[PDB]
Amino acid sequence: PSRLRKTRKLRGHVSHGHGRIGKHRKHPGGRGNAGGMHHHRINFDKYHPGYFGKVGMRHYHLKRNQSFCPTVNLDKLWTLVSEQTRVNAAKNKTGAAPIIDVVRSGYYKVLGKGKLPKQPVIVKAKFFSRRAEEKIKGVGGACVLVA
Amino acid sequence: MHKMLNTDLSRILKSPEIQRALRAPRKKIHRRVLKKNPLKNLRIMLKLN
Amino acid sequence: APSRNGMILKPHFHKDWQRRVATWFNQPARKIRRRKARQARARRIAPRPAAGPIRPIVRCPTVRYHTKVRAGRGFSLEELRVAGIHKKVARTIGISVDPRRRNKSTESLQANVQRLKEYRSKLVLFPRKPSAPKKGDSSAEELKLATQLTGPVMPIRNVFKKEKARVITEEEKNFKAFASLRMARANARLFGIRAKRAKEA
Amino acid sequence: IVNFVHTNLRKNNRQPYAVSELAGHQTSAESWGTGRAVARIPRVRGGGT
RNA sequence: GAAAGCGGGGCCUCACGAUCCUUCUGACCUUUUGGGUUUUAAGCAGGAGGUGUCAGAAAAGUUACCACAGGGAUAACUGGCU
RNA sequence: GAGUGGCGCGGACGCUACGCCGCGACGAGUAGGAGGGCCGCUGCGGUGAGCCUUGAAGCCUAGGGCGCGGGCCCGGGUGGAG
RNA sequence: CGCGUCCCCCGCGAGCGCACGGGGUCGGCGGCGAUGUCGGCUACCCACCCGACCCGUCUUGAAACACGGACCAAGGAGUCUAACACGUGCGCGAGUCGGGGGCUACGAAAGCCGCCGUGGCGCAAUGAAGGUGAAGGCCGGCGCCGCCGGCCGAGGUGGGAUCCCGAGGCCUUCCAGUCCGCCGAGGGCGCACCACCGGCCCGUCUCGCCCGCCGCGCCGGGGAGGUGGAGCACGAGCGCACGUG
RNA sequence: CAGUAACGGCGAGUGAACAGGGAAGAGCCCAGCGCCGAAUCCCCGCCCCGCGGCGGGGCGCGGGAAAUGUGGCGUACGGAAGACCCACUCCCCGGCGCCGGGGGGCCCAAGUCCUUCUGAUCGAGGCCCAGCCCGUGGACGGUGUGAGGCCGGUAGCGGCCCCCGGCGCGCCGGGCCCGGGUCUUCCCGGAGUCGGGUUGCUUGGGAAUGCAGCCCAAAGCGGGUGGUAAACUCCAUCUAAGGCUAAAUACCGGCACGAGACCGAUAGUCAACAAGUACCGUAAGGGAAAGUUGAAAAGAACUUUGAAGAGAGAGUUCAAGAGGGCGUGAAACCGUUAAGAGGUAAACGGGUGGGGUCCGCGCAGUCCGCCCGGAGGAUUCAACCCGGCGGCGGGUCCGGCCGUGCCGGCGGGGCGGAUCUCCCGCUCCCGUCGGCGGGGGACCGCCCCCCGGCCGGCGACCGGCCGCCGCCGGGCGCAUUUCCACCGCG
């Protein structure tokens, strides 16, 4: 939309909204991220701290799949199953705990951010946190591991 | 889903539920009054003092 | 020159990029020509499946993906061997063949052997001279009821097991899964010099 | 919504238009220099036309 | 120092220096990429090697053969104030 | 405010609510910023049962007017298809 | 300027009219009228009084003995693409999005897929790293246990738009009085948000004491007190479109 | 994936790959090792069919190539020979007869109907109570404006004649006479090349990713790779230094088409025209300007002045106020006609006055209610019958339909659910508990529908009989009523 723009209301106005004392000249402070350590030092030090210099070890050939570990919390754990399972698990009197395979849902590790509703459950995860495990012992459950 | 179900505010604003819980209209217009100098104008001075 | 707080950008446009802009006005004519060539082929190989041959079941490598299943390239020779199909007959009756595939496991094998037994049962085979049949061919009942197949032949879907709600054992609740992880990590790390010091001992 | 969705959907059935990439620059012109009382633009390189 | 206390440099106001690279020091430290042992290398933390144009380019002249962009923001004339 | 006891067939305008109305104070302005344009140009989707050889665009004008202005609308002439 | 009644001393008359009264009216008049006069501001020409230096631009300062401009017509200068940030409109919402692919004149459009969400961005951070990875008191048994258990359980303070209760009260010649509607003394629940104090997660330091076992070891886990983080503390994101930088 | 791992005066900047989802999908052959009497190939001369891709057959003590290795078998997925089981008759290239992709040419609906405007119609109005006619055709172009119907075309899984392809039955020519499963017995491979040292370039590739020069130069339970230099050691993964190979991809050149929210002759290609032209440069090279009379030339016979260019009359045309570089005809600037003015260069803002130009189509001057005052006219009100239509409420009638409503039924199904469990598959122990995967059947959820009852509605969604009011039409009424037009200086 060229009608709604600012240009259309600078027609008549001399400088086209770029000043009279200092003009609209081409590149009056260099191009791109230039002058970083010299005449744009304050902008870089103030809004982009730690930009210049080296930190840590170089890992030449890095494959992102070996370090693949998507997390779920106990908050959203009962949502990988139906509401049917949770309801019928309390409705059953035998003490049978429904089995939540976490890797079927597409999470490897279980973290322990969440409050858990009070019924027994088994969790077939690839990894477990300490507080994550303790909370499922606290509710009265199991932590089966997956290879 | 609709953002308001019943879009007939003709019916709504005169319906007894709403009209019950209103305050009376202030429908009388008060234009400016010309200031008459009551030191010259006797009756206006009597209207004040 | 930077104004205020804002992201520090590095646009890759320092070369003669305007000469090598590739614009996609081809796209709806490219889709039409592909759909044309597709239907042309599907009519050419007339009663044979439109997708072409049957691809085998294959696990994705790399831990990120190995919980999935794809279509593989072609059936290993030691899957054809134990299924009882010749590697030079297989390709002529519509079975993809890969001469590079190894078989580390026997379940990866046995799934693909039962894949070929189902395929060789489903397959209708026409006479090479249509008036005089041969032994390994189909019955004229099935030959008149034979039809062009749409989409990938015996398609590969990804099904998981059903685990019924069980009562949690007194040991199963007792097992320390976090401590097991942590002490499996240290047994993997320190093992090498635990063998060294025990050798020097 | 229909005004927005009609405005944006109608731009999809639209053949592109441009000028020639080479148009304008197909000469060998150069600036004359600041002397010789002309206006310092490029001028078509000399001849008898 | 008997003790109250006083002392983490000079009675006080000055005496000094970033990224990169190097060099040393520290832990029974992490990593060296398919697994182990060992040299090596890379890391993490703290000092030093120095930028005196001292918030820190690596740097000699000449042009009367000279050239371009500008400047009355700036000299060689008049004119003005003194 | 509300309950139980002690003849004549009449009544202006209004309220495009994105509208209409009432009262009070205020109004310099370069660079610059924002808003409102029933200011103007050229093309596309809708729409005006639009205009037009009984004369479209364009152009000229001591003609008649509107708008704070951008501009615009009628009269007369020329012109010949939008 | 009525008495029928409330003290210390000596509740509705009726009219008519004039107006220094919430902004001007006349129920007053008089001329002149068809090719010679009436109106017509603006607009053509002229005269007179007052005012009045030539625009643009850089400049502390331009009418300048500063530069550009003889005159006229047509052309003629913040655009498009990618990136980012913030505001704004729309759709869905712990999600969101087919953009690449496939299916069945206008139309190279529109429609559809979900076992086409691969994937992108989001829902978890911190460490160079290996790695680790987001709330608890009490009540018994084992003035104490590493725990066996049992009940309940996402903080506190101050300010906070609204909401809630209601000491009393809102009339017609009274007295009780019943129902709705309404005002309000004072007293409570407290949204978002702000300030403060707690707490939890990761890194790292100081001090110390207990627990575990298919693998008793330079094995693994735990506690208290500061401290570094682009964190948690019952989600706000994604896609599209527009605006300014 | 990803502006990521990485490179970078670690500054400015630069910057891939694997995995994953698709588009497409296709695989093979030598040398070597070996066995088959060189079993192989090229060419001349004669004959026959018969080949605008020079090919098949017969014939020759015709000639050559080749053991310094041609062909058959055969290649890392193993191969070959010998023994025992097992079972086949059909692959391939070239003539034909017939039906069932493209290039060419010729064609196929309906108004020039009746009045009317114009120079000319394609405009305007009309065309049965059979909405002019056709419409699988209402794209576009031409035609004296603007045309579905005048013409070419357009539509059509429309017609006809030619020509060149593609495939299958089978007649018919030629060749080839060929399989697999298991043991025993042999065999197995590319060297100035890998590799290392150094040098230069290159890379995202960092103690060196790729390529190259020179020097050194291998091995065979080897060699290569395993993103940090090196030694020892397990493990994984390929088989380098020989070769061929479709499809999916790219395309401002070329031949042909179709289109556009693009430009509309100072624009758009430099080029709408005798444009890469004229012209310029010794040359390499540089490189313009330039569209439009009119529907139709009907392009001005003839008279007349002049040496002629040029005029003046006639004449054609709707028009020369369109006259051959001629549609429209702006401004600058110039000529002339009219008006006014004029010694402070002109021009300018404010305020008037004077004169023009046209305009009000000026010049006896506003209409509007009701009433009163006179006078005319009309078949005329109020009421009451008969009909049709509408409104509301019928507070709460009778019957219907709906529900981002709800409660029932032993009412009859669709999807769904990470809710549960009877038949069949393969195999394991020997018809055979139990294992295995895929179908069925119970249960929960939402939904669709049939019967039942409330609650809401019918104002985003209704009828019929009542009742009242209102309207319209026709009777009836017929004048102190009602209603029209005209005067009164009301």
Quote the tokens at residue C137.
């061919």
- Which chain A residues contact residue C163 at CB under 8 A? 99, 101
Per DSSP, the three-state class of A110 is strand
CB contact under 8 A, A66 and C63: yes
Approach to solving: cryo-EM
CB atoms within 10 A of CB C64: 17
- Please state, in angstroms and as integers, the Cα–Cα distance from residue C6 to each residue in A31, A36, A45, A46, C9, following that order: 16, 15, 13, 11, 9
Query: Can you tell me the distance from the alpha carbon of C152 to that of C55, in angstroms, rounded to the nearest whole number?
Result: 9
CB atoms within 10 A of CB A75: 13
Query: Can you tell me the distance from the alpha carbon of C186 to that of A48, in angstroms, rounded to the nearest whole number?
Result: 40
- Helix and strand totals (H; E) in chain D: 1, 2
C82 phi and psi angles, rounded to 5 deg: -80, -15
* Identity at C183, one-letter amino acid code: M
- Which chain C residues contact residue A141 at CB under 8 A? 168, 173
Kindly report the nearest CA distance between residue A83 and chain C, in angstroms.
14
Query: Can you tell me the distance from the alpha carbon of C96 to that of C103, in angstroms, rounded to the nearest whole number?
Result: 16
Are A122 and A97 contacting, i.e. CB atoms less than 8 angstroms apart? yes
Quote the tokens at residue B28.
């009388």
Query: Can you tell me the distance from the alpha carbon of C112 to that of C82, in angstroms, rounded to the nearest whole number?
Result: 10
A37 phi and psi angles, rounded to 5 deg: -100, 0
CB contact under 8 A, A141 and C173: yes
Q: Which residues contact D24 (CB under 8 A, 6 or more apart)?
A: none
Q: What is the DSSP letter of A7?
A: G
Are A103 and A145 contacting, i.e. CB atoms less than 8 angstroms apart? no
The sign of the dihedral angle between the CA atoms of C124, C127, C133, C135 is negative
Looking at the DSSP assignment, which residues form a beta bridge with residue C95?
A: C54
Per DSSP, the three-state class of A40 is coil
Are A133 and A141 contacting, i.e. CB atoms less than 8 angstroms apart? no
- Pairing between strand C57-59 and C69-71? antiparallel
Phi-psi region of B40 (alpha: psi -120 to 50; beta: other; left: phi over 0): alpha
Quote the tokens at residue D24.
């304008």
Query: Can you tell me the distance from the alpha carbon of C124 to that of A59, in angstroms, rounded to the nearest whole number?
Result: 56
Quote the tokens at residue A92.
């059953």
C75 CA from G101 C1′ (Å): 26
| One-letter-per-residue 3-state SS of A46-104 | HHCCCCCCCCCCCCCCCCCCCCCCCEECHHHHHHCCCHHHHHHHHHCCCCCECEEECCC
Please spell the DSSP secondary structure of C28-87, one letter per residue.
Answer: HHHHHHHHHHHHHHHHHS-SS-SS-SB--EEEPSSTTTTTSEEE-SSB-HHHHHHHT--T
Please identify which residue in the block is written with the tokens 């494959």: A63
Are C147 and C47 contacting, i.e. CB atoms less than 8 angstroms apart? yes
Per DSSP, the three-state class of A14 is coil
Query: Can you tell me the distance from the alpha carbon of C185 to that of C182, in angstroms, rounded to the nearest whole number?
Result: 5
Looking at the DSSP assignment, which residues form a beta bridge with residue A142?
A: A122
- Which chain A residues contact residue C177 at CB under 8 A? 128, 133, 143-145
Q: Quick one: C132 exposed, middle or buried, by C-beta within 10 A (0-12, 13-18, 19+)? A: exposed
| One-letter-per-residue 3-state SS of chain D | CHHHHHHHHHHHCCCCCCCCCCCCCCCCCEECCCCCCCCCCEECCCCCC
Looking at the DSSP assignment, which residues form a beta bridge with residue A97?
A: C166
Record the resolution, in angstroms: 3.2
Per DSSP, the three-state class of D46 is coil
- Which chain C residues contact residue A103 at CB under 8 A? 67
Nearest nucleotide relative to A19: CA against C1': F31
Query: Can you tell me the distance from the alpha carbon of C171 to that of A57, in angstroms, rounded to the nearest whole number?
Result: 44
CB contact under 8 A, C167 and A143: no
A11 touches strand F (CB under 7 A): no
C46 CA from H10 C1′ (Å): 63
| One-letter-per-residue 3-state SS of chain C | CCCCCCCCCCCCCCCCHHHHCCCCCCHHHHHHHHHHHHHHHHHHCCCCCCCCCECCEEECCCCCCCCCEEECCCECHHHHHHHCCCCCCHHHHCECECCCCCCCCCHHHHHHHHHHHHHHHHCCCCCCCCCCCCCCCCCHHHHHCCCCCCCCCCCCCCCCCCCCCECCCCCCCCCCHHHHHHHHHHHHHHHHHHHHHHHHC
Candidates A124, A123, A129, A121; CA nearest to A146 is: A124
CB contact under 8 A, C2 and A47: yes
Quote the tokens at residue B18.
């709403």
Candidates C88, C85, C160, C156; CA nearest to C123 is: C85
Per DSSP, the three-state class of A145 is strand
Chains that touch A (3 or more CB pairs under 8 A): C
Any idea of the CA torsion for C193, C195, C196, C198, to the nearest 10 degrees? Answer: 120
Query: Can you tell me the distance from the alpha carbon of A116 to that of A132, in angstroms, rounded to the nearest whole number?
Result: 10
Cα-to-chain-centroid distance, residue A80: 20
Describe the crossing of helices C177-200 and A130-138 by its angle, rounded to 10 degrees. Answer: 130
Q: What is the DSSP letter of A43?
A: H
Candidates A99, A116, A110; CA nearest to A72 is: A110
Please identify which residue in the block is written with the tokens 């004519």: C29
Please identify which residue in the block is written with the tokens 């580390």: C104
- Please state, in angstroms and as integers, the Cα–Cα distance from residue C60 to each residue in B47, C68, C70, C71, following that order: 101, 6, 7, 10
